[PDB]
Amino acid sequence: SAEDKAAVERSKMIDRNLREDGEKAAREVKLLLLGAGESGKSTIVKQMKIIHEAGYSEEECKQYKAVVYSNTIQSIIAIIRAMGRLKIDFGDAARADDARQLFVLAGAAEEGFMTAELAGVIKRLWKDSGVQACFNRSREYQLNDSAAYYLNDLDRIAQPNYIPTQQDVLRTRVKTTGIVETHFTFKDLHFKMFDGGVTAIIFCVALSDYDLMNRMHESMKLFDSICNNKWFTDTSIILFLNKKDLFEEKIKKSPLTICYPEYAGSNTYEEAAAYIQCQFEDLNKRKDTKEIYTHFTCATDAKNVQFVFDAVTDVIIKNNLKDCGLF
């Protein structure tokens, strides 16, 4: 900036002076990433690799090829299968053969793959109007949020010499079991980020889960437990209300009352998102002693993540540095 408060607070530290080569020491920030499955945790991890470190080499991208294929195959199959549950016919009754062929093809391979035959089967289904009506009713079943991303780019992805772009790798969903740890440097802070006691927590919420039980209420219960937990008294709690892009589109056609029956505001982006923010922040029992730092995010949008992470780093610099060691 110009006259940055964080840079000023930072310069008040004197602990480097107590080390022999102190200005070269590493200030460590430990970040714990939390939140329900599908809330964007692993996308944030990947954005940190892309924005602040190497991103993915082409060799790295080539390894993600069959993952892109597999994710695409999962997505269309999830949609076609929901057609059966929801009793939705195809636009063109000839797509029944394409649907059938999809299961034959998926059924006889071991891992994700792509051929012009498979791609044609999928374009025709994705294009179909009954399939699109089913896709548009996905709150009713379980559909990944990278589904439209890959299916709209099927031509590109299907080319014989396809190499996944970085946004393609970002958009993948990979089954991790156990704890994922990443390291990166930003603003001369050395971050250790842990993803299914500690400088800060980033708690992710899929805003777009409101109209799906009640996934949003499950997310609230987890945040209540975490925010009020005594282990985290001196931890900065940061709340990422994520998938704001998908939420912005859903709120036009789907009322918040589905998730909060008592809600009486307008069904608009600004009103509904403010309400959700208030519902989460009110689970803070230590309002007097503890603050929640809430940000609206689009985790698959690097410009937004960079901007938000920049603000988050300033909060840590101004508030937590006295608890971050040098190594």
178 scored as a contact of ligand GDP (CB under 6 A) = no
CB of 321 to ligand GDP, least distance (A): 28
Using the minimum distance from each CB to ligand GDP, give the nearer residue, 31 or 88.
31
In sequence order, the 6+-apart residues with CB closer than 8 A to the CB of 191 are 28, 29, 30, 31, 48, 182, 183, 184, 185
Residue 266 annotated as part of some ligand binding site: no
Using the minimum distance from each CB to ligand GDP, give the nearer residue, 35 or 164.
35
7 Cα distance to chain centroid: 30
Using the minimum distance from each CB to ligand GDP, give the nearer residue, 10 or 217.
217
Q: Site map for ligand GDP, 307-326, x if CB under 6 A?
A: --------------------
CB of 243 to ligand GDP, least distance (A): 4
Beta partners for 238? 202, 293
Q: Which of residues 184-213 bind ligand GDP (CB under 6 A)?
A: 204
**What burial letters (b/e) apply to 183-210, b meaning 16+ CB within 10 Å?**
ebebbebbbebbbeebbbbbbbbbbbbb
Choose which of 2, 12, 17, 37 interacts with ligand GDP (CB under 6 A): 37
DSSP string, 117-143: HHHHHHHHHHH-HHHHHHHTTGGGS--
Which candidate, 291, 178, 300, 158, places its Cα nearest to that of 232?
A: 291
299 scored as a contact of ligand GDP (CB under 6 A) = yes
Choose which of 78, 246, 258, 326 interacts with ligand GDP (CB under 6 A): 246
Choose which of 29, 38, 65, 121 interacts with ligand GDP (CB under 6 A): 38
Q: Please choose, out of 17-25, 239-247, 270-278, 314-322, the segment that lies near ligand GDP by the rule CB under 6 A.
A: 239-247
How big is the chain, counted in residues? 327
Using the minimum distance from each CB to ligand GDP, give the nearer residue, 42 or 277.
42
Q: Which of residues 115-174 bind ligand GDP (CB under 6 A)?
A: 144-146, 171, 173
Rounded CA separation 166/97 (Å): 34
The secondary structure element, H or E, covering residue 168 is helix 166-170
Rounded CA separation 90/84 (Å): 10
Rounded CA separation 228/290 (Å): 9
Torsion of CA 69, 82, 259, 250, to 10 degrees: 60
Antiparallel, parallel or unpaired: β 236-242 and 292-296: parallel
295 scored as a contact of ligand GDP (CB under 6 A) = no
Tell the residue number behind the tokens 């300033």, with chain if given: 314
42 scored as a contact of ligand GDP (CB under 6 A) = yes
CB of 169 to ligand GDP, least distance (A): 10
For ligand GDP (CB under 6 A), the number of binding residues is 21
Beta partners for 189? 27, 186
250 scored as a contact of ligand GDP (CB under 6 A) = no
72 scored as a contact of ligand GDP (CB under 6 A) = no
190 token code pair = 């050395």
239 token code pair = 């709340």
Using the minimum distance from each CB to ligand GDP, give the nearer residue, 234 or 249.
249
Q: Could you list the residues that contact ligand GDP (CB under 6 A)?
A: 35, 37-43, 144-146, 171, 173, 204, 242-243, 245-246, 298-300
Which residues are annotated binding-site positions? 38-43, 145-146, 170-173, 176, 195-196, 242-245, 299
